[PDB]
Symmetry: C2
Amino acid sequence: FQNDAKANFPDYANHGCVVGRHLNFEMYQRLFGKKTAHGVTVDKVIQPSVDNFGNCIGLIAGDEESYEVFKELFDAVINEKHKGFGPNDSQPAPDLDASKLVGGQFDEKYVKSCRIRTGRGIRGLCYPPSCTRGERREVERVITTALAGLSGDLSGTYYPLSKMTPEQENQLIADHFLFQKPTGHLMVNSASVRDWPDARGIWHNNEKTFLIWINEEDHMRVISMQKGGNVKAVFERFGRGLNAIAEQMKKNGREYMWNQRLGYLCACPSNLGTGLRASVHVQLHQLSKHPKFEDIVVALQLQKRGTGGEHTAAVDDVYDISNAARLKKSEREFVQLLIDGVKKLIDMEQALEAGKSIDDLIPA
Amino acid sequence: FQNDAKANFPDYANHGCVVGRHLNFEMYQRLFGKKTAHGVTVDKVIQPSVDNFGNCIGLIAGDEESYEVFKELFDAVINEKHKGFGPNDSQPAPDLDASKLVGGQFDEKYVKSCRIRTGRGIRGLCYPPSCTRGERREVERVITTALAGLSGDLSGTYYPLSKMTPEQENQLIADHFLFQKPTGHLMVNSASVRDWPDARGIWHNNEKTFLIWINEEDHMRVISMQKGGNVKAVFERFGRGLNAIAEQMKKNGREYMWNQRLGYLCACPSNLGTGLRASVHVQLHQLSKHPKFEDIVVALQLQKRGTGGEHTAAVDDVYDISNAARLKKSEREFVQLLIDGVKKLIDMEQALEAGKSIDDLI
């Protein structure tokens, strides 16, 4: 018996995973026996790709170093997932400059709310798939004490999952601020839900416009949000908060994981670059009945779902509309892409409300 | 920040796991940073105890060496779970000699079937929580090649899960031979269902009285079964199969994980020693109405449940009765215990048939 690459090569028969279309035995052999400084192995980063037989990526970083040690695997997967982003391609520098935005205030008869979300890793520490209980507590500590140094409209409280009272959790559900133990194949099969809910928590400011999840999917999931259509205000707080949290973090010799090639690093390659999800809830009575509705959203580089997450109704024809991509444009640009797309959606809605053809508004 | 024991010591608050009751911080410090020859660590073997808050053991061996490297923790959990098995206690030598059984034919008006299960690990290869795809595949090869060398009443066929046709699948379901991806906490949280259904499979003899599961919970799960009450014949085929496969395994330089103290080793310490579960399906119409039924079964060192597995209603007053313990008695002795126990139960059943009280018998 040899416990070598041959003995260990996954059987990707009947697997619709991205990893399986790029991880041929030869690559596997090259990467087999490699380990990051935190001991992440090829087997670790590809585990999800083996367990799950359906359409998935299947690749996940155990740590920041995963992207370089298994560079050739991440690079191939990234290039498919992000529809053209090869090894020599690079993510634009981060742009959290809200003032650079054009028209970031929607008509609130149509746009009911806006949020912008991203994730951050804390450099020096393994992602959820590979982090020890100690590492994870260090993420929680770093983010939480850094948070304690925010003031003004970013003054808030930290709610540990581990000490959550039924009161507190009931309120957080009402704010739609709660996260649960993940049950998705990705997070489960990557052992990203270990020791739940030790060092997991929810922080937010008093106004309930800035929300922080620690050690759910990412070390830090940052969400800025408001009812109404002032996405520019939402982005302004977003970038102000991110930079402010970081500044506190540097008191503690800590920094977001970020490199020039991939922008902000996260465990799942899908979320690289900006990992930015800018969304609005927008009411589209007429346009959603339009035969080219789906065409329009895709053409606008947008994604669409109901108001309650995936596979939920568009209650009262209110759709959650977001940017589809995550790489290749900056954070500010993605917000602008959402602004432009959503404004067009509204232009078409109003056109139809007036009984007009939107044939000349549809993206050609 | 230091990734040391203090930073990593579990929070067992609100945890009912056996582990948390014994794995204090000092013990965790002493075990922190140690690993087995297979890279198995203390965090690994304790993982399920941390993930699961319910009442469970929460300790799982990543490999055979886990019992020696993490011995003080394992021994502690072993002592408690098995109700008095300390470090200086030793498992009886195995005994698979069915000829030494006494009255190993049950009255078939009462016993409807007999079954004897155990598990074996293939030494040199990690247990499901830590085995690599390669190790797991080697486990399958070793076992399947051994099974292929079996003949006579043990002549049989291997059905890889990976190649399972719907036709095969439904026939296996019909026979109650099939197994699926485990969804239970210990198996999921120990990472023991990785790469499913790779290197998993089901082997059974032509007469369907011998069933082997490969790489489900254990490397090899072995089940001897017959309709009727010839537990002797079931035990005879059981031990002969275990020994026969072991002999075939010498062709691959392989053997079962076993030592003098703990007997046959498997991942979950619950199943040490013999890891033997001998059981009957036995009809006890009147005794099942008796107010001491459960108390009698446990007094006989047995354990009772429905024929639908855990806490299903018993149809037609048919119960799966089996030995409760796994350590301190040899395989043969556990079958004799079952035999002695069931016979007592049938005696009580028949006393109740005749309208006699049985408090003089309980």
